[PDB]
Design a protein around this ligand. Structure first.
Ligand code: GDP
Ligand code: GDP
Ligand code: CL
Ligand code: MG
Ligand code: MG
Lengths: 160, 160
């Protein structure tokens, strides 16, 4: 557990990869959860929910913290199916356009009931449940979220 | 690609997880490579070779840089069998005992010919090739290296 003050978060983002968990969440209709991001990077794009692991935080603890923060429902890591190690590179950062952000991302897939989520408004100003076909066809869904649904992008992803 | 100044590496290690690749390296007789570490963390322990991924460095590029740096032989990531995601927590760091180090680690296994390595002396002052049974019985092999030969404090799948 360590949420960093902004100065040290800036130095971290400038200097090293972030490590994060992305949640590929399915409902009862075979559709997947995307939120319209309010923060950089990938600001304004539809994206799966996800976030970074903190210093000295286990993956197990991060999964609980992040599902609760992103989805409004605390789930244990055993609820998730590990879905590979991905790499996301952005030209901007949480607080500006002056340096890049790099994430190494652990994907997890799971199915939920919509009524058990309490979707928060901090990181997204709208949410939708999209079919694979629809999300792949939309250039407003960021490429790094579309990639989870493309066979060609899964090739050579460690863990798949 | 970004090798950090010590000042920046210290801020990074204090503040966030490192992401690294560890190499489970087999020879033609089924033994595995361990080096006797000269740097913190895990200083003085026998450990598999491995190291961290830098800012804006792909896993593919890191794998080539790190195999060359650790083994003296450059191999592509396609040569490696993904061997799980692991989490390693140390009470010390490269610079001393003032803060902890946290790694999220991707394991990769592959076989080499001993005669094709050029084992470097920067990070290890000796190297041995041990059977799985032998290294598991040796307490001078760090617990975090022994874990690759059991069992699972492991996230995800061995490839294949
Ligand atoms: N100051 C500060 N902000 C953080 C830290 N970690 C994440 N954030 C920010 O908190 C918000 C949510 O974090 P997260 O879901 O991990 O980021 P995401 O990659 O933008 O979805 C974003 O605006 C992040 O930039 C941190 O340790 N310190
Ligand atoms: N100054 C500096 N040292 C680094 C950096 N990355 C790794 N090191 C050090 O370089 C050496 C080899 O790095 P690596 O194999 O990644 O780390 P290991 O976990 O100690 O095997 C170790 O002494 C590390 O502490 C960095 O960006 N800057
Ligand atoms: Cl050999
Ligand atoms: Mg997030
Ligand atoms: Mg190393």
């Amino acid at each position: 557990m360590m949420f960093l003050r902004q100065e040290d978060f800036a130095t971290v983002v400038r200097s090293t990869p972030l490590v994060s968990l992305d949640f590929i969440v399915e409902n009862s209709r075979g559709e997947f959860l995307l939120g319209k991001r309010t923060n950089r990077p990938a600001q304004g794009y539809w994206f799966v929910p996800g976030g970074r692991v903190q210093k000295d935080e286990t993956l197990e603890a991060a999964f609980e913290r992040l599902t609760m923060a992103e989805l409004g429902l605390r789930l244990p890591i055993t609820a998730g199916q590990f879905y590979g190690v991905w790499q996301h590179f952005y030209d901007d950062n949480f607080s500006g356009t002056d340096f890049t952000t790099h994430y190494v991302v652990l994907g997890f897939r799971f199915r939920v009931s919509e009524e058990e989520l309490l979707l928060p408004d901090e990181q997204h100003d709208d949410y939708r449940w999209l079919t694979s076909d629809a999300l792949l066809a939309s250039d407003n869904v960021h490429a790094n979220s579309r990639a989870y649904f493309l066979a060609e992008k899964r090739t050579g992803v460690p863990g798949l």
